[PDB]
Amino acid sequence: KWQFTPHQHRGPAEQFGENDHIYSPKLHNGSFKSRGLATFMGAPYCPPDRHKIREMGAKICFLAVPWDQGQIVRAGASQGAAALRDATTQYFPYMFEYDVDLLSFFRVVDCGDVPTVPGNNIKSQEYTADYVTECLEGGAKVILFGGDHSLPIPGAKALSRFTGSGKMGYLHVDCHLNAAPDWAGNLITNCSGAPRALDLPNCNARNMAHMGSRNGLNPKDWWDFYVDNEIRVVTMSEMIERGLEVCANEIFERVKKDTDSLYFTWDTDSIDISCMPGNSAPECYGLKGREVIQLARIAGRHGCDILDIVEFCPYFDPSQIGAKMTVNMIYHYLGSRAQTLRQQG
Amino acid sequence: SYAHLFSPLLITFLRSAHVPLNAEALKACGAKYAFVGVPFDEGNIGKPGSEDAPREFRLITQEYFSYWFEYNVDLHGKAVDCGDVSMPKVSPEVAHERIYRAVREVLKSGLIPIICGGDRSISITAARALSDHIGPQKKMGYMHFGAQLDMADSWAGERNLAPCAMARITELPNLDIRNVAHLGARNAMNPKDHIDLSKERGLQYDSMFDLFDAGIYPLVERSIDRVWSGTDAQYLGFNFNVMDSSTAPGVTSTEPGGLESREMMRIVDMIAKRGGVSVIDLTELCPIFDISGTAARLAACVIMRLMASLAAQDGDVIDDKLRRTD
Amino acid sequence: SYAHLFSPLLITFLRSAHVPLNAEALKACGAKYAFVGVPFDEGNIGKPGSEDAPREFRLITQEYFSYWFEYNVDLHGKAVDCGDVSMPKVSPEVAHERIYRAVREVLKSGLIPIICGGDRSISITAARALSDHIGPQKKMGYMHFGAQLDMADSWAGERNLAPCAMARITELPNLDIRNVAHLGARNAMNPKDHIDLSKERGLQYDSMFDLFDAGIYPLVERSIDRVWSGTDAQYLGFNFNVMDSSTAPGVTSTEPGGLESREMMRIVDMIAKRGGVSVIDLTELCPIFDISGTAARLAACVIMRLMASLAAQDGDVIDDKLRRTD
Ligand SMILES: [Zn+2]
């Protein structure tokens, strides 16, 4: 069931060593120069189906959600998952910073993409929730890769349903406050992740938080949402003044306190435009490169049930910097998660 | 109506109204700032592109909303846009004459000119305009951010190209050298005579290395005090090559080892604490060299945040209790 | 004449003179450094493009003035350009033999080679050339900045490709492991066998995480001391993927969460305090991935600032009393 070829290539120069994927390639160059038929991390493909996932014993499902027609700004995020997958060919699945083989530790699988129905945000978001449900019911935690910032609407819906009578936290890291009650009447655009989460029956204001906001793409009602519902916001300014570790640790304690599950949506426009030009609405005065990795590390120490990463648009980046930053956001989350689990026995 | 503060139910700075470059129209329109485009580059001895900056900068500003939640300020109505100073080509004498007239004309209105170049030599004439506006019995101060001192007494036989700009500005008779700041100079585009003239005239520039050595903000605060203390008018100018290359690629002459955007945003707040400014310039944006409009966006956020921080200082804030359901 | 110090009235490094790869000619020319282009990319295991780096790097350096006011040093005359090593395509062993002979020849002159790739495997051969040059009775030190350890004993069955570079360099017989430094290693392009082989040999690498936990400079100092204290010659190399992606996009394998421009410029000064270097290399610039030349321009500034800082340490400064219009 759960099988992959180290360094990808089959045929006459196939490698078969059980740990060959954490070492320098032996018979050939693997996919470091030419991508071939690369999955995320070179992991096994596994359909997003609770039976297949269960049978493989996968504990992490990577699922792309390229849907980019749920948004108010500009399309493009549909193309990000392919750049992300391609970027994973420039890395091993072994992280020396954590001494972890991510691929065998979690039995990661790539579940391919969530299908879309163009022009139909309602049905596309239903597909997304149904697909995320399979991964959860299969016994895995999930990494969801957007796609526009409508993603946490079906994402959190699915985790909420799965969590049942338990309680769920929601964390949102974004340049933008994304708390439109509606946008020109529409309740489920990329502008309403946080209000739609508060509407879930087992998601409570005391376990919700926002970090990373700044600048003037933030109508007043988006701020009023947090004031009126008593939901903590840590602005980019506060994170700089008080310090990332201090703020992040407070916020993770907040969103995990007496919860059974945590949803964490991370917009790539939280990252400074200097490190992330490839974005639907990029912004100065954001996270620096080392801070992105530190936040990922901190998130991995605390743990979440679904991590989503959204709004990466590779058409607007001529380099590999955007795609490789998104790899690192995931790989440091997982690396730190495994180190933490292992230390906990 | 306050509908524009909230999620919904002509190429001008901030989508602002146009008002002609006319003191009386400007005085009557109700705005506090007047945007003026100056697509002039005959002072530029480097790579071309600054002439398209005013258009690119306007367009970037059209993407933000007028409300700045960090400050509880709305900018709607605070600015208007006078269009561009119209210039003949290869005609530098007469270009400067027209720029001078335009800035005198805005100053006469009482509004604050936001002057967008174009190349850095336009500062010479905008500064001379403010000098003449206030006159010989008032005191001016001047602060400029950039990687180059521009302290050439002459360059290639000329006296009003961009590399002479500070050599001309520091000659203005009501600008005492002690009320002059220059922040960010670094790297090699600074010939020895630029240093020698500075030392001769007592220009206390803050080199980028001086700044980093001091933790930045303490030395900035000192140089703000020199420019704003005991002065009747203050001129503030930006070349965004003061920023690190990664942060502002689309400028005429990028330089590694500059400011981060977070440090400039704190510096804007420190300036805003003094509760006013007489002229604001930005020159040497170069949008053909820009990626995802990074430099233009950085510049737009700096200018808009300075407007918003000044409004917050003046207590000119929105009513906190307004809600979309009104 | 000193006209180049002041405001004014072949593609080569710093617009320097061409001088043949000839020990006698180089010794005579007056320069201290000799630039050697090495557009070889057949040790590259990753994305293509480094072949174009020597050209693009040279072009950026031609934009600079020669005088650095922060050091009071003039770089005019300090370098010459020996052109590119003549190398066959599809014949790496012969290419590497040509590089070897080019490097020994510059070293024979007493000038410091500045070697620009091209891929990281060229360091193997340049480092071997320095090892052999100084001989069995001398001690070498080696310091390299990069995000990758490059400690593959073998890669695809091959022994002299880029990811093998440190595995070969640390085998040089007059390079004690105690005199080796590697700074910046991070992220997942660092497989377990590179870590194992490092541990086995006692390579005391300073990972990016180790550097941040230390506030950078206290740990860099300790490693500079290991390389310079008690060695006869020192090899200094750069892969600019040691830098944060933001300030080095145009490299073979860009990496987030690394050094920023101002931190590397401080490191350069700390190195210069030791008063000499034997060889300088830079590899894996990759212009097809660059954002407005950002990486190439950071590289250029690093290299030129190291030359200037070193001259300042040596008291090779300009007469301050010198003035323009002389
Ligand atoms: Zn966003």
JSON list of C-alpha atoms and ligand atoms in Angstrom, two decimals, chain A residues 73 149 172-178 190 210 217-218 222 266-270 279-283 310-311, ligand 1:
[
{"chain": "A", "resi": 73, "resn": "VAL", "atom": "CA", "xyz": [-8.68, 40.42, -5.41]},
{"chain": "A", "resi": 149, "resn": "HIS", "atom": "CA", "xyz": [-8.20, 32.57, 1.22]},
{"chain": "A", "resi": 172, "resn": "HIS", "atom": "CA", "xyz": [-5.52, 33.17, 11.35]},
{"chain": "A", "resi": 173, "resn": "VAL", "atom": "CA", "xyz": [-2.21, 34.72, 10.24]},
{"chain": "A", "resi": 174, "resn": "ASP", "atom": "CA", "xyz": [-2.60, 37.29, 7.53]},
{"chain": "A", "resi": 175, "resn": "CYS", "atom": "CA", "xyz": [-1.72, 40.86, 6.54]},
{"chain": "A", "resi": 176, "resn": "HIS", "atom": "CA", "xyz": [-5.51, 41.15, 6.21]},
{"chain": "A", "resi": 177, "resn": "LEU", "atom": "CA", "xyz": [-8.06, 40.86, 9.06]},
{"chain": "A", "resi": 178, "resn": "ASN", "atom": "CA", "xyz": [-10.51, 38.93, 6.76]},
{"chain": "A", "resi": 190, "resn": "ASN", "atom": "CA", "xyz": [-11.91, 34.96, 0.92]},
{"chain": "A", "resi": 210, "resn": "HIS", "atom": "CA", "xyz": [-5.44, 36.74, 14.46]},
{"chain": "A", "resi": 217, "resn": "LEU", "atom": "CA", "xyz": [-6.39, 46.85, 3.00]},
{"chain": "A", "resi": 218, "resn": "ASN", "atom": "CA", "xyz": [-8.56, 46.37, 6.09]},
{"chain": "A", "resi": 222, "resn": "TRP", "atom": "CA", "xyz": [-13.02, 43.79, 9.78]},
{"chain": "A", "resi": 266, "resn": "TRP", "atom": "CA", "xyz": [-1.65, 30.99, 7.14]},
{"chain": "A", "resi": 267, "resn": "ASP", "atom": "CA", "xyz": [-1.78, 33.55, 4.31]},
{"chain": "A", "resi": 268, "resn": "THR", "atom": "CA", "xyz": [1.52, 33.99, 2.42]},
{"chain": "A", "resi": 269, "resn": "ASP", "atom": "CA", "xyz": [0.87, 37.75, 2.43]},
{"chain": "A", "resi": 270, "resn": "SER", "atom": "CA", "xyz": [1.71, 37.71, 6.16]},
{"chain": "A", "resi": 279, "resn": "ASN", "atom": "CA", "xyz": [1.08, 36.78, -3.98]},
{"chain": "A", "resi": 280, "resn": "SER", "atom": "CA", "xyz": [-2.47, 37.93, -4.83]},
{"chain": "A", "resi": 281, "resn": "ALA", "atom": "CA", "xyz": [-2.13, 41.06, -2.63]},
{"chain": "A", "resi": 282, "resn": "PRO", "atom": "CA", "xyz": [1.49, 41.35, -1.37]},
{"chain": "A", "resi": 283, "resn": "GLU", "atom": "CA", "xyz": [2.43, 43.76, 1.43]},
{"chain": "A", "resi": 310, "resn": "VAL", "atom": "CA", "xyz": [-2.90, 30.19, 0.89]},
{"chain": "A", "resi": 311, "resn": "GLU", "atom": "CA", "xyz": [-2.62, 32.90, -1.79]},
{"chain": "D", "resi": 1, "resn": "ZN", "atom": "ZN", "xyz": [-4.25, 38.14, 2.96]}
]
